[PDB]
Ligand binder design. Structure first.
Ligand code: CA
Ligand code: CA
Ligand code: CL
Ligand code: CL
Ligand code: CL
Ligand code: CL
Lengths: 302, 297
């Protein structure tokens, strides 16, 4: 990396800044074997995979990428439809990045926003994927269809971060550290920062400290309220299901299971899906790294 | 801060929960006016003088708002529940010898007002609610579209200190943005700049912001539960009522307001007025005219 103060949490992994038509994608790359792309979510960066990626690199060529606009990836300028931060566009961008590495058919695991990229990739371009894992999510459509008083109060940030700019940007800009740290803690099982490595927390904090990075996060959530929802609605209403073998993992105290039975939801969206809970909040790869690594290795190796 | 109420006096009214500030003017039958968020009693300045042609007009700051005192809240947000606020205002009115009065409210003050009417109908001769539906009805309509439109119902209701921390960064931005965004114009041009300054100065105080978040927490929890009991009981307000709303406001966004109010009140009339959510400032003549006609009657 180019930031002198931040830890290297993937000892021995290389790196890559991969050009695409929407901007560079930063990734750490390690291991050997079949290619496996790992995609983080909010308010994190690729480093969230640091306690799973080395175990996966014993079996796979692991590509640990910052999402478009996140971490050290470039931040394309957005537009009125939030286009570069839609899951459709991110998926296209990451497909281009993987081609740069010679990977036209690969395995994919995503967490949170990255899981949203991942299932959208599978809907739009299933030929790209051998197998898919989604961690800690339901489809975006399913979150919004669950909207009611209880869900609006229990899971407020979808609507808040989606408000027109500059509302969330101004609110987040006064004390960004307090907001990101409280979010990271709130969504864990225990409600504190103990599940995270402090060095990883520093990566998350430093990213969140940049106004441009916060803007991207809000654009991601705007897309999540608008285009992403629309795209998902088209698929569900058409009865399109992902044909790619799929794994759904979620924390037992996470967001996805708030008011759903996640495997039943996924079966509506995918024709060959398996899945299981793990005792954890919303940050499976950090909260439950050994169980998450095992479940992924077993799924992708089968 | 400017005086926007020619002919009105300034009163601190004692209650068991603290002082209520009011401007008081006119003579005749008593009429209480209750503001909402993120405003103070000043919001009535374009309509109150017309009302005071005919009525003794009491323009009060809600409990914890403006210059009223701030009772200490608790884990159930009790002093900022509409039921509690209504009780406190009933006490304040009793200090003036008013036990049967007319009432008009706007936004959170309208919520106080219909709750007052449900709990203590004998206190009211007539009731006007501006720019609202019942709390229960908003929550029953809280789908994706509505969650995006009225996000602040869930944001401000998050457990402390989340909203308070965010709002303290640039409170002037946020208050001004709320004021502007909820108007037809989408800017501050509908407001007297002197009024805007009252609202800005109130919102600049952290303790005042905390009250506003407690108000919204009650709105999410106890107020909802109180309303749900009345809906389950089939209780309707028997007090003659007027519902006015902005054609571009929040109340009409996901519902037909008079249809809704007819489910809650047995004697309701009403009308849209071309305006955003701030009827008394965006559309002062039409609002005053409707109120005078209604309350004279
Ligand atoms: Ca091997
Ligand atoms: Ca309408
Ligand atoms: Cl696109
Ligand atoms: Cl979800
Ligand atoms: Cl584990
Ligand atoms: Cl309101």
């Amino acid at each position: 990396g180019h930031m002198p103060d931040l830890a290297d949490l993937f000892p021995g992994f290389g790196s890559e800044w991969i050009n695409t038509s929407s901007g560079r994608i930063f990734a750490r790359v390690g291991g050997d074997g079949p290619p496996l792309l790992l995609l983080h979510g909010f308010p994190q960066t690729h480093v969230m995979w640091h306690r799973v990626a080395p175990k996966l690199a014993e079996r796979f060529k692991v590509i640990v990428a910052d999402l478009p606009g996140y971490g050290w990836s470039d931040m394309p300028e957005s537009d009125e439809q939030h286009t570069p931060y839609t899951k459709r566009a991110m998926a296209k961008q990451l497909i281009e990045a993987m081609e740069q590495l010679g990977h036209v058919h690969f395995a994919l695991a995503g967490h949170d926003r990255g899981a949203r990229v991942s299932y959208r990739l599978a809907l739009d371009s299933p030929g790209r994927l051998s197998k898919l894992a989604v961690l800690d999510i339901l489809p975006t459509y399913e979150y919004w269809q669950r909207m009611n008083r209880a869900y609006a109060l229990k899971i407020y940030h979808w609507s808040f971060l989606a408000q027109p700019a500059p509302l969330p940007e101004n609110l987040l800009g006064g004390d960004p550290d307090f907001y990101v740290k409280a979010k990271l803690a709130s969504w864990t099982r225990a409600g504190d920062l103990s599940a995270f490595d402090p060095r990883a927390v520093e990566h998350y904090r430093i990213a969140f400290a940049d106004p441009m990075r916060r803007h991207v996060m809000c654009e991601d959530y705007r897309a999540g309220a608008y285009a992403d929802f629309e795209h998902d609605k088209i698929d569900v209403e058409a009865g399109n299901k992902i044909p790619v073998p799929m794994l759904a993992l979620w924390g037992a105290s996470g967001i996805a299971q708030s008011a759903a039975t996640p495997l039943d939801v996924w079966r509506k969206w995918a024709s060959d899906v398996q899945g299981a809970p793990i005792e954890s909040g919303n940050f499976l790869p950090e909260e439950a790294p050994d169980q998450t690594a095992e479940a992924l290795v077993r799924f992708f190796s089968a």
